[PDB]
Amino acid sequence: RPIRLLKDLSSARDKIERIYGLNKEKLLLLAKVKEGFETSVFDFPFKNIQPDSPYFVCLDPPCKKESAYN
DNA sequence: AGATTGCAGCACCTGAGTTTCGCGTATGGTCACCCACTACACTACTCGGTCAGGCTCTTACCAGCTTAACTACAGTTGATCGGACG
């Protein structure tokens, strides 16, 4: 297909592979976020951001990646 | 596992935000024409002085006389004048 404007990505699965690629470990996070927040229209369950949640997802900013003070 | 049903994918008609546009309406700009005012040199008719022409008025008579005044001769006294003073 000549996928060149947003309207060419008509199929939902085609949109996700075109916008997010096929790295299996990356696609997990999208499935977790979808199930953990689809019903969260204006607010989300406290139980979903907790470190033990079945839907827990957390990406640390690059400044946190290793100790920087020294 | 079939009769009932939803998802959602395909295609084509459609709708607005956005744009480009045409005109109104009106405004500053070109430039062409012809007008007003000015003026140096000129055109030309009249007025004016001068002159002649020639018609015109007014004089004053000649010698004499006879009505009218001067116009000379003539004598003691002025006061500027010269030229020298203060």
Q: Is the CB of A10 under 7 A from strand B?
A: yes
Q: Resolution in angstroms, to 1 decimal, for this deposition?
A: 3.8
Contacts of A53 (CB under 8 A, 6+ apart): A36, A47
Closest nt to A14 (CA→C1')?
B9
Q: Is the separation of the CB atoms in A37 and A44 below 8 Å?
A: yes
Nearest to A18, CA basis, from A6, A29, A26: A6
C-beta of residue A41 within 8 angstroms of C-beta of residue A31: no
* CA A40 centroid distance within chain: 15
A46 touches A36 (CB < 8 A): no
Return the closest-CA partner of residue A26 out of A13, A16, A14, A15: A16
Distance A39 CA to B85 C1' (A): 166
Q: On chain B, which bases lie within 7 A of the protein's CB atoms? A: 8-10
State how far the Cα of A42 lies from the Cα of A16, in Å rounded to an integer: 24
